[PDB]
């Protein structure tokens, strides 16, 4: 009864504050009951492919990503690429969503997804005008930047990912712009990419953005990120709090300020201690940079 399960999970994620726990508990139930394995078996049957992919896309949570990686990554990447090739916009959104989440597991899994065509599929879809698809693409590239590690940055350089990112950063949609800028803020730690970023001028988009958006309202602006990111994702963003580039530090501080507000309402403020962001934030709350300092201080107060 996929149509009914997909509706339940969609409604669960959408509950403000509680949707994080509700979606996680349902998606974990799917794994423990054997339903996740059934979806992976069915996603290679042409008749059951899109319905299976539609539910997979909504349940690629932390532990389920591990399960897919261990049991059938090649099948899931294939279905996602099939979906991006389909003409229906509903399909394109699903395929790009799957790939966005498969880039949030590990360096090695990013390498496998790239090997199987996942990055090529995302870059191809960057040509679309569909906002939801483009939002998935920008998020996928931010995730790949955060999780790919050094090996995969060389592969991003060869495929000219920075080039695909800069147009997304100048997009007028705030969610596309934000996640494109987050990817860029992460990648400037790579000195070869840094040169291209400085020439682009995209980093100049940060100061107008963070001073014009209230972190709390921005969180509520898109259902997909209303509950924030996982501690494993935030752990990987912590180093940007001490980036070489002032603009990147500013964006990371804004992000942590937003996450602090969200995690306060969930009772998960302890994750910041676990990922050693408290000390990284305390340092920024004392530095001369007034923009980043204010955001980090508000984050600590929210924590
Ligand atoms: O609330 C969340 N996500 C919320 C959300 C919303 C709508 C859909 N989905 C689906 O879930 C899978 C991605 O999972 P995520 O990478 O976790 O987003 C994908 O299939 C996605 O379509 C998730 N995450 C979270 C938060 C706090 C902590 N924490 O406090 O440690 C840990 C994790
Ligand atoms: Na919310
Ligand atoms: Na914008």
Q: Can you put this structure into words, describing what you see?
A:
This protein is an all-alpha fold. The chain has a domain at 202-303. It is built from 21 helices and no strands. Helix 3 (35-42) crosses helix 4 (49-58). The chain starts with a helix and ends with a helix. The relative contact order is 0.07. The chain binds the ligand O=C(NCc1ccc[n+]([C@@H]2O[C@H](COP(=O)(O)O)[C@@H](O)[C@H]2O)c1)Nc1ccc([N+](=O)[O-])cc1 and sodium ion (NA) (2 copies). The ligand O=C(NCc1ccc[n+]([C@@H]2O[C@H](COP(=O)(O)O)[C@@H](O)[C@H]2O)c1)Nc1ccc([N+](=O)[O-])cc1 binds next to helix 2 and helix 4. One sodium ion (NA) binds at residues 16, 220, 226. The PDB classes it as immune system. Keywords: neurotoxicity, axon degeneration, NADase, ARM domain, immune system.
How are the elements arranged and paired?
Layout: H1 2-14, H2 19-32, H3 35-42, H4 49-58, H5 62-71, H6 73-85, H7 89-102, H8 107-115, H9 118-125, H10 131-147, H11 149-158, H12 161-169, H13 174-187, H14 191-200, H15 206-212, H16 215-220, H17 231-237, H18 246-266, H19 270-274, H20 277-286, H21 290-302
The protein binds ligand YRJ and sodium ion (NA) (2 copies).
Summary of the model, kept short:
The chain is mostly helical and 303 residues long. It has helices at 2-14, 19-32, 35-42, 49-58, 62-71, 73-85, 89-102, 107-115, 118-125, 131-147, 149-158, 161-169, 174-187, 191-200, 206-212, 215-220, 231-237, 246-266, 270-274, 277-286, 290-302. The protein has a domain at 202-303.
